[PDB]
């Protein structure tokens, strides 16, 4: 679309390598603003990376690590905001890339602004022209103290920069790869300019350069983009009280008429994923959710992994299982690792038992993600979550996935009530006996065209149909979560209890 989320993988190995490039193709296709970190890792030598050609802004950091692609096509990329930094210091990190494989040229033709953070280029045997770039020009005026560790060790001959490059500062062999200088050339005290002359100065709200002197002509926005106009702040919704008709909402680095689908509106006018302190989530008839101050002391809510006391807890275990008893909505995520059902002898924590998973029988909403890398082998399905209706995906596992099921022994999903996957992707891989992945209407669950299901190494569909494990005839359109009439997504004829009948 226009904005997309990033990834939080960092240097970790892909969970499902056989679909890794596909998640990347689903995350960044047609996306211009990466509202997160742009992590390109573990890419095979001949990977097709054409889906990254529309990216112009990364709000977090850019990490290009452990790749064999000779070129990464990020030429359009204009500004890295550095809201998040790699290793807490770098907004651009190019590490361990490398007939011979490995990144040969950065080719960041449009990169002219790095608002916060620095540059880390280490151990790239075939990279060229990385030392010639005047990184002080790219860094913002208030980001001058940013570090800049650029390794120079090279295992190949480095051709000279193109003759057209006046200062021999180039991103590549090509004449089009000459670096454009914005900060340094500026006559006067201009932060950025398009040319030597004082008239060529950029407006104060512009970032990374400008096509002209006005605030519309900025190549990027230093603070906020209000419909092509760069602004210090989004217009206020109220002007002390009466409504301001021209007021907007602050979402990312943009001013928007309304907060997006999965986000929360705040009274001050910010679009958020978690309500502020002493605030509660208030849904409406149309389905928009807003953050409101608690009129009386806030009612107790149910927190999951990644939130409050459970912020550093990695898995749902017998130590914290009773925190979810009777819990209809969980603010946070649920992860089920092998440590959950195997136990930790050092901590003396007992292994989780199947029956205790019946604390999740009233669960209806997860605001974070659902990650299951281990399940009890007695249970043939995820029927403890059969009343779960929505996984919001406001917190994503690895930054990309709201529903992940790997290495399980479940024969069918059995997620009858699941109807919405608000954000993020679904990953189902290496579940040997799982037969009902394809029968699920995943497009109905997904709310964005970016969202997709990534499945691999599960039980072959021909094998499942040959066994006779398939959708019930009573199920409408072939959409079911498991065998039998209880598992139908929609009843074709009639409903008695939870079961389809005729």
């Amino acid at each position, epitope marked *: 679309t226009q904005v997309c989320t990033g990834t*939080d993988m960092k240097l970790r190995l892909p969970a499902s390598p056989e679909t890794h490039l596909d998640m990347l193709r689903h995350l960044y296709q047609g996306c211009q603003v990466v509202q997160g970190n742009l992590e390109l890792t573990y890419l095979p030598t001949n990977a097709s990376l054409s889906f990254l050609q529309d990216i112009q802004e990364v709000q977090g950091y850019v990490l290009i690590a452990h790749n064999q692609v000779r070129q990464v096509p990020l030429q359009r990329l204009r500004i890295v905001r550095g809201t998040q930094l790699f290793e807490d210091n770098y907004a651009l990190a190019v590490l361990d890339n490398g007939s011979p494989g490995g990144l040969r040229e950065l080719q960041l033709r449009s990169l002219t602004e790095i608002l916060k953070g620095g540059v880390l280029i280490q151990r790239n045997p075939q990279l060229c022209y990385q030392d010639t770039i005047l990184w002080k020009d790219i860094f913002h005026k208030n980001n001058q103290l940013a570090l800049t560790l650029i390794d120079t060790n090279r295992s190949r001959a480095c051709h000279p920069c193109s003759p057209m490059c006046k200062g021999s500062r180039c991103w590549g062999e090509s004449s089009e790869d000459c670096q454009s200088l914005t900060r340094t050339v500026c006559a006067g005290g201009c932060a950025r300019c398009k040319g030597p002359l004082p008239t060529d100065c950029c407006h104060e709200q512009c970032a990374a350069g400008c096509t002209g002197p006005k605030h519309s002509d900025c190549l990027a926005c230093l603070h906020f983009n209000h419909s092509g106009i760069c602004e210090l702040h989004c217009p206020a919704l109220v002007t002390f009280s009466m409504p301001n008709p021209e007021g907007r909402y602050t979402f990312g680095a943009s001013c928007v008429t309304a907060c997006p689908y999965n986000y929360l509106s705040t009274d001050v006018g910010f679009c958020t994923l978690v309500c502020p*302190l002493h605030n509660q989530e208030v849904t409406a008839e149309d389905g928009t959710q807003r953050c409101e101050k608690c009129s009386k002391p806030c009612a107790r809510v149910c927190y999951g992994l990644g939130m409050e006391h459970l912020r550093e807890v990695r898995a749902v275990t017998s130590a914290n299982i009773q925190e979810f008893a009777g819990c209809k909505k969980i603010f946070g995520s649920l992860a089920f690792l092998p440590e959950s059902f195997d136990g930790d002898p050092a901590s003396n924590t007992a292994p989780l038992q199947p029956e205790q998973l019946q604390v999740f029988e009233t669960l209806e909403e997860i605001t974070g993600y659902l990650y299951i890398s281990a399940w009890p082998d007695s249970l043939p399905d995820l029927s403890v979550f059969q009343n779960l209706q929505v996984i919001r995906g406001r917190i994503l596992h690895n930054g990309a996935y709201s529903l992940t099921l790997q290495g399980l022994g479940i024969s069918w999903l059995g997620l009858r009530s699941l109807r919405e996957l608000g954000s993020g992707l679904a990953l189902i891989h290496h579940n040997t006996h799982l037969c009902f992945v394809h029968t699920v209407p995943w497009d109905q669950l997904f709310r964005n065209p970016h969202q997709a299901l990534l499945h691999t190494a599960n039980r072959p569909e021909d094998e499942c149909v040959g066994e006779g494990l398939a959708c019930h005839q009573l199920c409408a359109r072939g959409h079911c979560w498991g065998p039998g009439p209880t598992q139908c997504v929609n009843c074709s004829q009639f409903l008695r209890g939870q079961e389809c009948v005729e």
Partner: antibody
Amino acid sequence: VQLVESGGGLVQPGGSLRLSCAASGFTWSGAYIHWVRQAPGKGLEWVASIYSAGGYTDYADSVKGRFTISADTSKNTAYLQMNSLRAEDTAVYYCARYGTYELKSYGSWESLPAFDYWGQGTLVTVF
Amino acid sequence: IQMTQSPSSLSASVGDRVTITCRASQSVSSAVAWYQQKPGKAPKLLIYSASSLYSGVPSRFSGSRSGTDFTLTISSLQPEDFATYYCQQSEWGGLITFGQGTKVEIK
């Protein structure tokens, strides 16, 4: 993003004093502006808070009814008016910003539940 | 008026690991913050959400919660880590409260 204090000094008991704190972008950042005092040789004590959005105010029990906190949105400056000061009110008064919104992942703006920025402090002495 | 802080005073050498526990009213973990104040200077924020590291703060500062107790831990004490340490809490109804203060003195 800085906070600059002003208008602190020597006050006669039962008198009044007006403390000024200027903050960059207070009325649109969505944050609170607090006043926190530190008596000499004692610890930090919270005094008052003002919301940007609606001008909602809050005070500590000790200062409730004597101190009034206001904001001038046009000049973007918070004012603390102190009346009927006593010996206990002699303190260094810091103005601090609480609840500022920061960009996080996925384009979400989240409030900071802490005092990220403090003023340098102004000494108020009641004699 | 002030949540309890223990110890009131603490003495240690450079490199030592030191713990401060703040007994406060029971509340959500995001309402407890930890601030460092050098004498004569304004306080600076260390741990906003009782575990989360503020920007520009060294990783040697850690926060943890154990029931109503909130713990500030310095893994390796440094010469610039001798100051007063405060725990602050936000309750519903707009009240902000502070700890009494923990002072770390060099040996």
